[PDB]
Design a protein around this ligand. Structure first.
Ligand SMILES: Cc1cc2nc3c(=O)[nH]c(=O)nc-3n(C[C@H](O)[C@H](O)[C@H](O)COP(=O)(O)OP(=O)(O)OC[C@H]3O[C@@H](n4cnc5c(N)ncnc54)[C@H](O)[C@@H]3O)c2cc1C
Ligand SMILES: Cc1cc2nc3c(=O)[nH]c(=O)nc-3n(C[C@H](O)[C@H](O)[C@H](O)COP(=O)(O)OP(=O)(O)OC[C@H]3O[C@@H](n4cnc5c(N)ncnc54)[C@H](O)[C@@H]3O)c2cc1C
Lengths: 478, 478
């Protein structure tokens, strides 16, 4: 009754704003409903971009220490946390500003409010106010927005653990990115990538680390051999790496937060920390938007299941990004958003989920895509693997990262590449070649005969394929 | 009469030792004739590996300066040239040692001597002695080696300019890599990649630079738009960038080498330098091995022309690497060596030269492959280009390299990708995806639908393809 659109996008994250801009490029009249002032969602405001910005600066600090043995001597740096925090916020504010300008240029209306479904064709938007991301309150004003199509892109939120009380020293990923102080002793609860990245940053800045994980290893889903290389190089940062251990008590006290662990190789006495980072996963927000009032089905865990066109059970309502399933990754959200937008424009478009890369921007990076040794064993798929160790790379040796490696995985029956993994610097920038090779159905001969430049880390992809064919001359005979 | 082999390889560079190891893996009895003690040729001993090692360390020094605005403050480094030189030599000696061990393991005989053809099936090897690369002398002993097949891999040498006299301050790329001192004022004669890389290293270490080039721009063969970005970021290193100017006089004097230039925007007074680096190209060594005594045809410029099996006009003698043609690149030499070795083993193998990448490991890097805008205009080939500016990349902005870009070139009639260029860090590690995409015949839809990880520099390849399809939502509508 207050406004009508071809497409209303609920949430302005990588999924939502990509969907909205794509729909507008197709000539549709679009609106984004986003409860906070800035676009870009979790990835831009409190996720990928600020975390990788801190990680990049931290990695140079680490490189500088290794420069002295090469005759380039620097002291320890003087660290100004206030200027480091402003540098990271300055990257985000440059990007959020650009996104707003791009919305206005594409004539996409941006509404600041909390959206809730009224019926299959209307959102009720409780308008919000506040400029800072994650800090907006309802004004009390309400606006009803009618749509032909809705694209649900309401993302995820930090998973909470019930047994952990509230205390300013107990933080989540957003608290970590706020960079209030460098704690002397930092506990990471949860072994996943997001907490390990934050630990890397704080470790380089001066924090001692512990980490606890109920499951059997860190970075669940990554092949163990990549994680083993990451762990060996990072062991010096940690006083306790505790896997298969339960966290039973978090007790804040005057001089620290005291945490108790039950594990076969975990200490028994409670451990004091200056800060505790809860990074135990993220939960989708499907149950929080009144979707049933639109007829949209939502699972018990809060996911909104979609078909390959990104359609919910309600044919004119789509859903994309973290809220439809794993993996919760920004580049998935973007592509899914393109697919949903083109279907809103009447162009039959489908989303292929087989090749979605994952990257830990730790030091070293851990990048992988497609079939893993873990999944192949779980499904029974017969595979062959080819591994090129960076101990054989003049580039890696010169650069001081000769402990990395590049691994390719092929289907045993067909010979096609179906997966790949890289541990070592720039893995994230190199895994795209593996993604493309899987998409194209390459075999080992396709990749090995492709002439990669020397001396690079990227040529390890071609040489690993040469390993698969038995004709790598930079390694012993195979 | 002194020894007989299935395959004798003349020269032990990237081509030669790769050919020899591949032939031995095929079960042939092989020997390498190499006048110096170490294997790996120019690339390992006085080329790729030591230059990129110095470039890498220099790039960290440059990064450290930009860290202060982000609250990470370091002073200028204390530079120990002796320890820097030993670090670079230590990388090479680790690699040369490994190559020797790999030769002995593969049962490939290594002969230290200067090889000259005696007749179509014999080499006469004037044995040499000396441990340092480029510093060996004949002992006077001679050895005659008989072969079924010979693979010529005798590489190239520094091009000399006749009008330049001898003086310890007038150096070539090997002199530059020796790192005797940091000159106050360094003149680079020649605008090609090798001299610009050395200039980058010395500039960061403290040298002022001038550069002179008879031709119309620096880095001939690279598309001008990539070089323009490199130049803008490097202008501060140079006092004079002189293109279209002739070098008419090099006059050594007590207090410096005085050089006179004739150019439309070059100074007229002679300029004093502490050091002059002659980097005016490299010449192939085909005229220097007595090839005509084997029946092998050699061009006037010293190239040995081969067919796609790497065969000379003499069917049982092959030739690979710098000595058969441009581009003079190590990864070309390696692949050509594999092709020659497999044909020596009776397996028909062909070498495809269409996709050979070139990389300047300058700061920023300049990586390109395949069709360029320059070549397309020279041949008349109709093309379309798609350019993704790194000003739109959150990764590049966070990292401080948002001036780079990724450019893809497609055939206008067929739509297939036929070329690509990247300027900015890690281009060398990313161009391999472009190489593979050209090899596989990808179009823009193949590359754009491939899901690249966010936030990376590598996803610029996928987004440039999205630009080509008109559906990039991180840029204004196209
Ligand atoms: C610390 C951290 C690091 C990460 N690092 C990476 C990485 O390196 N690479 C990577 O690919 N991914 C990374 N991620 C994950 C990435 O942020 C998410 O996968 C991505 O942001 C999801 O995109 P989305 O559009 O589905 O959801 P979101 O980014 O979560 O956007 C959803 C939006 O909807 C809004 N919203 C929610 N409910 C409502 C409502 N009812 N009304 C109105 N608006 C609403 C929210 O305010 C939010 O802006 C990281 C995440 C974190 C927290
Ligand atoms: C400063 C510099 C930087 C470079 N950077 C790069 C780069 O980053 N990337 C890249 O791909 N390329 C680079 N190159 C080029 C690269 O070094 C060459 O393309 C490559 O080494 C050629 O391999 P090759 O086997 O054909 O010849 P070579 O490496 O030249 O090996 C030929 C060998 O034959 C031996 N020989 C010659 N004549 C005789 C004889 N009559 N008897 C016995 N032995 C003999 C020589 O001693 C030599 O070891 C660079 C070169 C230089 C100088």
């Amino acid at each position: 009754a207050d406004a009508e659109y071809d497409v209303v996008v609920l949430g302005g994250g990588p999924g939502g704003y990509s969907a909205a801009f794509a729909a507008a490029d197709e000539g549709l009249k679009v609106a984004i409903v986003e409860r906070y002032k800035t676009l870009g969602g979790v990835c831009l405001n409190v996720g990928c971009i600020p975390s990788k910005a801190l990680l990049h600066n931290a990695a140079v600090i680490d490189e500088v220490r290794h420069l002295a043995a090469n005759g380039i001597k620097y002291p320890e740096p003087e660290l100004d946390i206030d200027m480091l925090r402003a540098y990271k916020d300055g990257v985000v504010s440059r990007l959020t500003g650009g996104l707003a300008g791009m919305a206005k240029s594409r004539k996409v209306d941006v509404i600041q409010g909390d959206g809730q479904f009224l019926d299959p064709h209307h959102l009720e938007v409780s308008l919000t106010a506040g400029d800072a991301y994650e800090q907006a309150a309802p004004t009390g004003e309400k606006k009803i927005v009618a749509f032909k199509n809705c694209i649900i892109a309401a993302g995820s939120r930090v998973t909470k653990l019930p047994f952990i009380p509230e205390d300013p020293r107990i933080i989540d990923s957003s608290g970590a990115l706020a960079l209030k102080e460098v704690p002397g002793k930092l506990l990471i609860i949860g072994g996943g990538i997001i907490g390990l990245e934050m630990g890397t940053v704080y470790s380089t800045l001066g924090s001692r680390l512990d980490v606890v994980e109920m499951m059997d290893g860190l970075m669940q889903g990554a092949d163990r051999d990549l994680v083993k290389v990451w762990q060996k190089q990072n062991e010096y940062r940690f006083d306790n790496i505790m896997v298969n251990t339960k966290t039973v008590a978090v007790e804040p006290k005057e001089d620290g937060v005291y945490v108790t662990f039950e594990g076969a190789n975990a200490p028994k006495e409670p451990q004091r920390y200056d800060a505790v980072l809860v990074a135990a996963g993220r939960a989708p927000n499907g149950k929080l938007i009144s979707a049933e009032k639109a007829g949209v089905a939502v699972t018990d865990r809060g996911f909104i299941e979609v078909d390959k066109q990104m359609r919910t059970n309600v044919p004119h309502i789509y859903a994309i990004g973290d809220i439809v399933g794993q993996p919760m990754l920004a580049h998935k959200a973007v592509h899914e958003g393109h697919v949903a937008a083109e279907n809103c424009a009447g162009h039959k478009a489908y989303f292929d989920a087989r090749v979605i890369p994952g990257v830990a921007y730790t030091s070293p990076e851990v990048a992988w895509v497609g079939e893993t040794e873990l999944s192949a064993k779980a499904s029974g798929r017969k595979i062959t693997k080819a591994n090129f160790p960076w101990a054989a790379s003049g580039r890696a040796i010169a650069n001081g990262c000769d402990n990395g490696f590049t691994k390719l995985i092929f289907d045993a029956e067909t010979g096609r590449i179906i997966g790949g993994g890289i541990v070592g610097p720039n893995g994230g920038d190199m895994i795209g070649e593996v993604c493309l090779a899987i998409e194209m159905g390459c075999d080992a001969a396709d990749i090995g005969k492709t002439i990669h430049p020397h001396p690079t880390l990227g040529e390890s992809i071609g040489m690993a394929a040469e390993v698969a064919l038995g004709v790598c001359t930079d390694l012993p005979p195979q």
